[PDB]
Structure 1
Amino acid sequence: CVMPLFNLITTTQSYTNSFTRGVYYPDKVFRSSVLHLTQDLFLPFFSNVTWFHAISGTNGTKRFDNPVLPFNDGVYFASTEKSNIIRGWIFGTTLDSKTQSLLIVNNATNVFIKVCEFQFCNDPFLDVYHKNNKSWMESESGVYSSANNCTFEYVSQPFLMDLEGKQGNFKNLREFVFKNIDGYFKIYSKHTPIIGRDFPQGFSALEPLVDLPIGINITRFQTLLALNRSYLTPGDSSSGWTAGAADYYVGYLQPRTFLLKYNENGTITDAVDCAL
C-alpha cells in the first residue's frame, strides 16, 4: 500500500434525474411481440441519482472522489470516460480481511474478478504506469496487501470495451446493474454511442452479461479510479500521478412492477412503470 501525496478534494455529489434508463432483462426466457408485466428490482422511472466527478486540476490539485455508498437492494451504475479511469469496483460490508469481499479489476486486455478476504488500503487504487517508456501496464499491488481464503477467482472477457473511437464523446455510454441475490450477483451491461454530451434521453435495454454464484454478503460498494504517472496531458511538465476526467452516476433500485414490451424481433423496445 503506497499512496503518493495528493491535494485530496472533498467529494461533490450533484443530483440529476434518472430518466427512463435502467431496464434489464428479468430472466433468460425469450419472448417476442408480447406485453410482459413483471415484478422485480428495477430502477424507478424519473428517479434521482448521485452524480460524481473525478478530474486532476492544472494547479496541482487532483480530485480524488471515492466515497463509500450503501448497496441496499441494488445499484445502477452508469459510466462515461475517455481513458477508462473507472477500472473496477469493490464490494463489502466493513472493508477489511475479517469478511469476504468482492473485487473487479479491468486489465485492459481481460476482466478480473476476485472474491477473497482481501485487505485493502485506506484509498486502494490500481497502479498503472509506463514500463521502459514503451508500453502501458497496470499493477494490483496498490489495491490489496494479501489475499487469503480465496473462494472465487474469475479471469475472462478478453474485450477492450471502448474500441469504436471517440466520435461523439469517447463513445463510452457504459451501464451496469448489480443485484444482490441470496446466492447470486448479476451484472448487466450495454455500450451505446453518444447522442449529445452526457446522459441523453432515450431507451435501451440492458442485456445480462455475467452471472456470479458467489452467495456472499454485500452492504457497501465503492468505485476505483485509475492513476497514471503523468504522460497523459501534452505540454505538462508536472512529474506526478495524474488522472483524466471521470464521470459516473449511481441509482438505487426498488421493488417495482414494470411492463416490458418485447418487440416481434427479440429485443426490449419500451417499458412502463406501474407506480410512476
Structure 2
Amino acid sequence: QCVNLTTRTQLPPAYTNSFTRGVYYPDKVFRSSVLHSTQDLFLPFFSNVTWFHAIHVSGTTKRFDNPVLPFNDGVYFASTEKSNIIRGWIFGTTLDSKTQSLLIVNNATNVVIKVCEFQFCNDPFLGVYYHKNNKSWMESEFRVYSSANNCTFEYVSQPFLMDLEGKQGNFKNLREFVFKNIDGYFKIYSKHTPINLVRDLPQGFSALEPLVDLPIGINITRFQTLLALHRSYLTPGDSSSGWTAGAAAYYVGYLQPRTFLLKYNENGTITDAVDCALDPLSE
C-alpha cells in the first residue's frame, strides 16, 4: 500500500538558532508573583535546532524532508504552517512490527492516537486532491501504516472538518510541542501563537501548557513527522511523482537537563525565564 516518493533533490540540512522559546510548565502547581527554580528537562535559550524545509519551486529544489529523527530525552517541535501541512508524528524505537510504537495523526476528521506495533514505511504521508469539479479537496490515501496488530491504546476525538485549502502568503500559524517520556508516561505540551512570518520565527516567549498525559510503557528512541501532499490535474506523475508540497517548515530541538528560573505573574502564567547555564550574568 505504501508508495515511495521520487523527484526529490537532496539539500544539505540547515540550522536555525532558536530563541528563548521552549519553556513549559514543569508541574501543575499554582504560583503567583514568585521566582521558582526548576531542574527538569528544558530547552536552552540558544542551541542548534534543525530546520526542515517543505516547499515546491516553479522549476529551475523540491524538498519533502521528513526523516526519522532520534529521541534522546525530549524534543521541541515547533511548526510554522500556513495550510495545516503537518498531520502528526510517529514515535517508537525501531518502527517495526516487533516492538510497539506510538501513532499520533490528524486525518482532518479525528485525532487518531493509537499505540500498536505497526509496520511503518520510509515515506509515510497523507495526500489531498484539488478537485476542480466540486471545488472541494476531500483528502484521501491515508498512507502511514500497512499492518496494525496487538493494539494496547486507542483514542479518537470528536468528528470535525478543519481547513484543508492551500493558503497563499506567509506562515499565519505557529504550533509548538514538547514531548517527554518519563516513568512510563508520555507527556505532551502544546501552545498556539498566531504570528505572521515567512522564515526564521521571531523572538518571543510562550509557556507551553500541558495538553495530554498518555500512560504507555513503551520505549521511545526515534520519531518521524507526518506531512501532507497536494495533487491536482497539473501534476506530472502516476504513482511516485505527480505531487506538490505546500509551504511549511518545522523545527526540532532536543531537551537538556538545566536549571531555569521561572517568573510567574499574578495569574499564574509564566512570563519570563532565565537559563543559568548559557553565559555569565545569568548564573
User: In the TM superposition, what whole-angstrom CA distance separates every residue of 1:167-221 from its partner, at most 9, and x where no partner exists?
Assistant: 9934211100001112111111111121685411111111111111112111001
Per the TM alignment, residue 17 of structure 1 is displaced from its structure 2 partner at its CA by: 1.0
After TM superposition, the structure 1 stretch with the greater mean CA deviation from structure 2, 22-31 or 122-131, is 122-131
| Cα distance change on mapping 1:8 and 1:144 into 2, 3 Å | closer
Q: For residues 74 and 192 of structure 1, what CA distance do their matches in structure 2 show? A: 21
Task: Compute the RMSD of aligned alpha carbons.
Answer: 3.8
| Cα distance change on mapping 1:9 and 1:41 into 2, 3 Å | farther
After TM superposition, the structure 1 stretch with the greater mean CA deviation from structure 2, 33-42 or 231-240, is 231-240
| Cα distance change on mapping 1:237 and 1:94 into 2, 3 Å | closer
After TM superposition, the structure 1 stretch with the greater mean CA deviation from structure 2, 210-219 or 234-243, is 234-243
| Cα distance change on mapping 1:123 and 1:130 into 2, 3 Å | same
| Cα distance change on mapping 1:127 and 1:238 into 2, 3 Å | closer
1:162/1:172 contact within 8 Å kept: no
1:165/1:171 contact within 8 Å kept: no
Q: For residues 158 and 262 of structure 2, what CA distance do their matches in structure 1 show? A: 29
Q: For residues 182 and 8 of structure 2, what CA distance do their matches in structure 1 show? A: 30
Q: Which residue of 2 aligns with 1:32?
A: 32
1:9/1:62 contact within 8 Å kept: no
Per the TM alignment, residue 251 of structure 1 is displaced from its structure 2 partner at its CA by: 0.5
| Cα distance change on mapping 1:126 and 1:263 into 2, 3 Å | same
| Cα distance change on mapping 1:231 and 1:122 into 2, 3 Å | same
User: In the TM superposition, what whole-angstrom CA distance separates every residue of 1:230-276 from its partner, at most 9, and x where no partner exists?
Assistant: 2699999999222111211110101111110111122110111121x
1:100/1:117 contact within 8 Å kept: yes
Query: TM-score, normalising length from structure 2?
Result: 0.83
SS of equivalent to 1:167: coil
SS of equivalent to 2:6: coil
| Cα distance change on mapping 1:262 and 1:247 into 2, 3 Å | same
Per the TM alignment, residue 138 of structure 1 is displaced from its structure 2 partner at its CA by: 3.5
Q: For residues 240 and 58 of structure 2, what CA distance do their matches in structure 1 show? A: 9
Percent sequence identity over aligned pairs: 93
2:131/2:232 contact within 8 Å kept: no
| Cα distance change on mapping 1:170 and 1:50 into 2, 3 Å | closer
SS of equivalent to 2:268: coil
After TM superposition, the structure 1 stretch with the greater mean CA deviation from structure 2, 119-128 or 73-82, is 119-128
Paired positions, count? 271
| Cα distance change on mapping 1:156 and 1:8 into 2, 3 Å | closer
Gaps of 5+ in 1: none
Q: For residues 28 and 165 of structure 1, what CA distance do their matches in structure 2 show? A: 38
Per the TM alignment, residue 81 of structure 1 is displaced from its structure 2 partner at its CA by: 1.3
User: In the TM superposition, what whole-angstrom CA distance separates every residue of 1:41-83 from its partner, at most 9, and x where no partner exists?
Assistant: 0001211211110122323973221112111001000001112
Q: For residues 271 and 234 of structure 2, what CA distance do their matches in structure 1 show? A: 40
Which runs of structure 2 are paired with 1:248-259 in the superposition (5 Å)?
A: 248-259=250-261
Query: TM-score, normalising length from structure 1?
Result: 0.85
Per the TM alignment, residue 9 of structure 1 is displaced from its structure 2 partner at its CA by: 7.9
Q: For residues 126 and 166 of structure 2, what CA distance do their matches in structure 1 show? A: 24
2:185/2:214 contact within 8 Å kept: yes
Q: For residues 159 and 32 of structure 1, what CA distance do their matches in structure 2 show? A: 37
